[PDB]
Amino acid sequence: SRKKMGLLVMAYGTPYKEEDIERYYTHIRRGRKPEPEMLQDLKDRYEAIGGISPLAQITEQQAHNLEQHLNEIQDEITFKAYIGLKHIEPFIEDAVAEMHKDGITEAVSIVLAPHFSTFSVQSYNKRAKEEAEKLGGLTITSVESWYDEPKFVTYWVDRVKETYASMPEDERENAMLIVSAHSLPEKIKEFGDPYPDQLHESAKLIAEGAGVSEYAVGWQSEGNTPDPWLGPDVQDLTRDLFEQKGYQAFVYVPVGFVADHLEVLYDNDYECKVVTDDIGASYYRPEMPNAKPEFIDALATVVLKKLGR
Ligand SMILES: [Zn+2]
């Protein structure tokens, strides 16, 4: 009696093994193969954060935990998860084609990134739709942004509360909360991209929920292009913030990301850690959503909200 639907979970993509690093970054760098040194540096970082295999993994766990959860919290629809990545196979078009081939005709998609941006989300969505329109006999309703879904906000708030709870009294009274997301070229402002505002909004929601009156919005992981990127970068923000007020502890909430990937384990847990360690402040960075039940239910609700269920 159930209606079959495709669950197109989209993401970035992540190397599966060390030997993928090259083509992965080459894809990311639009056909520009990293120099031998970059390559060696990149392998080192991945080794430094615990290896690669666990990364691509999380996304797979996120898709399937959601597929099963959605299939048990309601009995009108039976979902079948499909992973569409951006920089590695299975690519978005690939997933779409598979669904079509499997006979899917009605699908709903979601990107594993809370905030909407013309650069990423709109693109993954427009690509998924043009693939379906190309094959025909397949429609897709795409979720644009879910950074504001209450259960998702609740997740970050609860983690932050525990982190502040864990602090000594003197740190609890002199800490700084740094909410962040992947940086993006400033040019997106040309199109009125809500990305920056959604981040600030995520930051206002979380701080307000955890009862934090001292916090700042920042960006990280910016790429390499002549044109300027969204800032200030978390490294400079921390140092500058310490410079003017002298916070004894910093809390990083990379709300933009949903798991333990490079951008967090290294760019946060190492780069920001280097700076807090230099200024003598304490480093804190709450557990990422990953495939945890609480997170899956939030995503599940977002999908059901998108369907009017
Ligand atoms: Zn990046």
UniProtKB/Swiss-Prot annotation:
GO terms under biological process: heme biosynthetic process
* Pathway listed: Porphyrin-containing compound metabolism; protoheme biosynthesis
Alphabetical list of PROSITE patterns matching this protein = FERROCHELATASE
Residues the record lists as binding Mg(2+): E19, R45, D267, E271
Q: Name one GO molecular function term.
A: metal ion binding
Binding of N-methylmesoporphyrin occurs at Y12, R30, G31, R32, H182, K187
What protein name does the entry list?
Answer: Coproporphyrin III ferrochelatase
What is the primary gene name for this protein? cpfC
